[PDB]
Design a protein around this ligand. Structure first.
Ligand SMILES: [Mg+2]
Ligand SMILES: [Mg+2]
Ligand SMILES: [Mg+2]
Ligand SMILES: [Mg+2]
Ligand SMILES: [Mg+2]
Ligand SMILES: [Mg+2]
Ligand SMILES: [Mg+2]
Ligand SMILES: [Mg+2]
Ligand SMILES: [Mg+2]
Ligand SMILES: [Mg+2]
Ligand SMILES: [Mg+2]
Lengths: 210, 68, 96, 85
RNA sequence: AUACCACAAGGAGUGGAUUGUGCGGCUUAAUUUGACUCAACGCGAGGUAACUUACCAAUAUUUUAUUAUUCAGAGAAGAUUAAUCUGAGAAUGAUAAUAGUGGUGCAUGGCCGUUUUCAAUGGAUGCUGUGAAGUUGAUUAAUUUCAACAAGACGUGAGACCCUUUUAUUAAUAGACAGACACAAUCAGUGUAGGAAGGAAAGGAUUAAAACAGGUCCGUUAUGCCCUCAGACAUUUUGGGCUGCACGCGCAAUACAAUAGAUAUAUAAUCUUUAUGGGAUAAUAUUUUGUAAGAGAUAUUUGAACUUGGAAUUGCUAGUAAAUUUUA
């Protein structure tokens, strides 16, 4: 009963520390975060798409974040080590692909143009299919929704959970708020670097007689 | 549909702020020789600057609150 | 020397076993393997943020796996393995 | 409406680390530097209108980052023109 | 065609009494408010007192910037309990930020519910037409698999997959497949036999396109417009409310008794042989929690209606209904 109580408390730290990166790191486009807590330097690891801006400049962003994470957790400074890495493929990260729509919609480019660009990137990346939905006040007083489907996508059961990546972002505008949803279906690779290693249970291949 | 509360009673007045002029100079006396005659009492931890607040049964410090 | 393994997924506690069983039993000292049954937390909650529609409930869960070793050894024979066999996601609180 | 003694206690912390953690308790004092917590937040809110620091509020906590216009201004405040040793 | 949110064969109810709760009206200074066939009414995880709290009766305290004017170290604005420290901004304007459980879910996002124990849906090749366009029988929970066919192949949804119980044993692995035989074809369906388990092994979870002016601004540092600006439509303190009483309705707990009640050694023994069934309401006394009891607990007394309920209507096919117990 006591060992269950500890694992809950470190996760509420994780929920608060995730939404800081969604507010502070729009410029460089983080992909994820990972926290290691059971070592003497407790490890914060960040996967950002553009790490060459940070270590090339050597700004305070490596250090200002380092002071906050220890003072939040009441640990003294120089007890946390922050490690920065790259992201492998920019097309498969739906947080970066949805962030680009937040930039493009602010320059008054219409939504049919902005949705048509994000489908072309993942076709070069190699994903099998995507799904972008736009919803809200698009043309006046009444609201509607438009979805733009490319490729194939599976949305049922547990093997759906290994093969999709979705995210919800919103854009504020001068009249109303517009919701933005993006899904990305990851392709198979048995290396494990790019996608899930295991295979689909529907597809059954038969060895030749030889 | 909340509205302003109209009170049939007027406002109860607040006491006005006072400040005594040259209150710090009262603690010293000036002789005709030009020397200073000190009458107020300085607390033992803070003998250099601060004066003790003169009450009838108590002597009070404004910095440390030492009571005598 | 009671030492325990506490995890969140099955796959991490498996690869730590055959790495530890070959290194600790075959080389220096004996040991005992002990796996504890799982402990489950249940938070039954109502779905909608309203009281209008048909009232449905959902049950969330979180599982903890426990495998404990009971070893009696010399001093540095177990403590060299803590520095050597520290794996990445799992916790291993060692009680000497 | 803060004193000059504690206002330099704020600017000295921004030159070293550049970041500051403020909680949202309305009757407390900060442990790092002793200011009443409602007055300290109103001090940071007046710094934003000069543009020197940007803020982030999530999960009942404040996370503030100064900018290049602030880090230019803050080390210039404590600057001594000449030092003779 | 199909179905226990439809009948049929059956069985326990509800509607008739008492009480606990939610809705309507009414009353008052206030009895805060959303929802109204399935798809509102033990619903907002809304359980009895201060907070919660949006209502009434009273008290006390105040975020920022640009700029205009008057002050202000011959001490602004503060803290303390008239005299003691610390000490540099303040007061009224105007724009622009900040705040509101104040209005609009017929201005929005997100999260939901209902259709839905519904099964359909998209390119490409060929064929028909100038063109928009188009491609019967059996069986299955399922356009789920067959047969004939100007159609021949594919993809999505369903299925496959995942979690719990059961047999075994290295505890993470085997074990079930309609396998076997019979019932004239393929796809099926039924019966017997062996087995822990025989027909989706049993039960859940996940979950298409599309629709509703369905609910949610009183969950949110989600938001547009509008309204309010310092005894503020802000926030704090003390009492009173949300629970009141002529009256209509829905969901539930005990009862109308010998297939029972008290006592007990729980079949030692005994008693009640029809109101010793039934417990509402109320008094006196001891006592628990709380800043604060018409709140919970104990002894004795008082002992209501009630003897199986009009028209009508809900659920249910196996360890199911029904009855008695049990943690969070
Ligand atoms: Mg599928
Ligand atoms: Mg399925
Ligand atoms: Mg009745
Ligand atoms: Mg109250
Ligand atoms: Mg609001
Ligand atoms: Mg609506
Ligand atoms: Mg409506
Ligand atoms: Mg007010
Ligand atoms: Mg108010
Ligand atoms: Mg019940
Ligand atoms: Mg009786």
């Amino acid at each position: 009963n006591k060992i269950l109580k500890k694992f809950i408390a470190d996760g509420m730290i994780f929920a608060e520390l995730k939404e800081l990166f969604e507010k502070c790191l729009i410029n460089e486009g983080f992909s994820s975060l990972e926290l290691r807590l059971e070592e003497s330097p407790v490890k914060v690891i960040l996967k950002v798409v553009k790490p060459h801006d940070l270590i090339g400049d050597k700004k305070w962003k490596v250090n200002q974040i380092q002071h906050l994470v220890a003072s939040r957790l009441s640990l003294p400074d120089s007890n946390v080590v922050v490690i920065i890495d790259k992201v492998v493929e920019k097309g498969l990260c739906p947080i970066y692909q949805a962030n680009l729509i937040k930039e493009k919609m602010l320059a008054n480019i219409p939504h049919k143009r902005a949705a048509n660009l994000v489908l072309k990137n993942t076709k070069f990346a190699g994903a099998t299919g995507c799904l972008v939905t736009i919803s809200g006040k698009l043309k006046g007083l009444r609201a509607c929704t438009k979805k733009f489907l490319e490729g194939v996508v599976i949305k049922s059961g547990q093997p759906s959970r290994d093969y999709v990546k979705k995210h919800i972002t919103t854009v504020n505008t001068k009249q109303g708020v517009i919701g933005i949803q993006v899904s990305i279906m990851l392709p198979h690779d048995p290396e494990g670097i790019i996608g899930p290693s295991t295979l689909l249970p529907d597809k059954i291949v038969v060895l030749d007689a030889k | 549909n909340k509205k302003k509360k109209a009170f049939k009673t007027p406002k109860i007045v607040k006491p006005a702020v006072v400040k005594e002029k040259m209150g710090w100079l009262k603690n010293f006396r000036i002789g005709t020789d030009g020397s200073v005659q000190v009458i107020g009492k300085m607390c033992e931890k803070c003998d250099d600057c601060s004066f003790m607040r003169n009450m009838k049964f108590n002597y009070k410090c404004g910095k440390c609150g030492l009571s005598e | 020397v009671h030492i325990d393994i506490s995890t969140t997924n099955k796959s991490a506690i498996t690869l730590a076993c055959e790495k530890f069983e070959a290194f600790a039993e075959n080389f220096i000292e004996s040991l005992e393997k002990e796996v504890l049954p799982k402990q489950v937390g249940l938070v039954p909650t109502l779905k909608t943020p309203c009281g209008q529609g048909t009232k449905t409930w959902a049950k969330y869960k979180i599982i903890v796996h426990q495998v404990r070793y009971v070893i009696t050894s010399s001093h540095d024979q177990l403590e060299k393995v803590i520095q050597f066999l520290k794996n990445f996601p799992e916790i291993n609180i060692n009680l000497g | 409406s803060l004193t000059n003694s504690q206002k330099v206690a704020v600017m000295k912390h921004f030159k070293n680390k550049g970041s500051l953690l403020v909680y949202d308790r309305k009757l407390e004092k900060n442990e790092i530097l002793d200011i009443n917590n409602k007055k300290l937040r109103s001090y940071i809110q007046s710094l934003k209108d000069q543009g020197y620091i940007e803020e982030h509020y999530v999960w009942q906590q404040l996370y503030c980052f100064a900018t290049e216009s602030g880090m230019k201004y803050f080390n210039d405040q404590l600057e001594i023109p000449d030092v003779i040793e």
